């Protein structure tokens, strides 16, 4: 979560319904627009940000939602447009020994603006006595650790999430994939819409 990754996706047709058909997602909530509606729309760039968060905090990754992992780390604005997808992953991610290789940001001095990421390890410390780069009574690694194990109950087990953020810019849109394929019929009066010739 602290280094939430961002991938730019562009100049590419995509089938959103390939994600929709399975339909076992804990979420799939689409704040920006309807899930079925996604295929025919054209957007200039889609930014797919992926992180692993415990089950209780999957709700926090929503427009205008306030909580520890939706404030200090990844935060989405009131005007944010996109679809959020999530699914359980107790086998693939967690390990019996105890997965300790995901870490979250529990102390941050200043709130983070929308879609902003900070990878800094700069000791935070609410309070006076100048704490250095060495932690102490009120100085703290601002990246305390997630602990993941298989026996843990649903809501604490890892739930990897994607936050597609389809966006429009003034330049020609590229991300744009409908299918709509129906075989042509010849020698008949037919209503035809080819690649936009109606």
């Amino acid at each position, epitope marked *: 979560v602290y280094a939430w990754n961002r991938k730019r996706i562009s100049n590419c047709v995509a089938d959103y319904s390939v*994600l929709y058909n*399975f*339909a*076992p*997602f*804990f979420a799939f909530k689409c704040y920006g627009v309807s899930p079925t509606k996604l295929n025919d729309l054209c957007f200039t760039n889609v930014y797919a940000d992926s992180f692993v968060i415990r*089950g209780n905090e999957v709700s926090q990754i929503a427009p205008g939602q306030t909580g520890n992992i939706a404030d200090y780390n990844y935060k989405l604005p009131d005007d944010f447009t996109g679809c959020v*997808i999530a*699914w*359980n*992953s*107790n*086998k*693939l*991610d*967690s*390990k*019996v020994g105890g997965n300790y290789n995901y870490r979250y940001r529990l102390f941050r001095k200043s709130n983070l603006k929308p879609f902003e990421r900070d990878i800094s390890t700069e000791i935070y410390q609410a309070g006076n006595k100048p704490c250095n780069g060495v932690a102490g009574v009120n100085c703290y690694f601002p990246l305390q650790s997630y602990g993941f194990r*298989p*026996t843990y*109950g*649903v*809501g604490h*087990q890892p739930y990897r999430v994607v936050v597609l953020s389809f966006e429009l810019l003034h330049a020609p849109a590229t991300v744009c994939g409908p299918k709509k394929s129906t075989n042509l019929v010849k020698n008949k009066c037919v209503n035809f819409n080819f690649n936009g010739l109606t």
Partner: antibody
Amino acid sequence: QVQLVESGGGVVQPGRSLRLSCASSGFTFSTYHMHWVRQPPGKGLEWVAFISYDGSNYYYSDSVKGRFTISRDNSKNTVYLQMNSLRAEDTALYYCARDSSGWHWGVPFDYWGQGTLVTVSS
Amino acid sequence: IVLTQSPSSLSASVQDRVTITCRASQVISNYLAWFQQKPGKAPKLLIYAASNLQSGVPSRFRGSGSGTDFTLTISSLQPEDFATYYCQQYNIYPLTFGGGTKVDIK
């Protein structure tokens, strides 16, 4: 086409170990997880141990602990379970299960296997 | 980790609607599976995630529920679809299965 045929079904004395070879066919063995479910005669399905996609994750059932080693050789295409000591109670027909359940793509125990009539005798 | 299926034996004639219920000690959050072991063969999975039919070979075996209560209501039962029904959680890894319900003939 899709199948999870099994082998290594034979009578075994208690305290003696027999490797059970669960072969695979028509599947990408690496991505699919495999786990073992046993049905004692005149009872109901029970669960034993699980191996992940990488072969790096192993979790075991509380009833038998550390008494079995489950290993997935992708090149062999065979998940192997061997039980160090077999109790008289475990006279079940061991069943092999294919579980794609953490990938935004799959559902649990999708195919199952014909099974091997393991036996404990004295 | 503990699942109990209440209707151990139900006898239904053709076209009867049979409802089978299994509940869990702790919330399983829509992660339950129902299977139909016909006598003399290995089981086949009939529902996954409590609400979704699987490969689609089963067509009338609707089942539903979230959290503690999940019930599988068969619709126009045909005589062939008579066989023990078993339920297990599919996401908490110490997986367990219920005792089972037998839809026998009258």
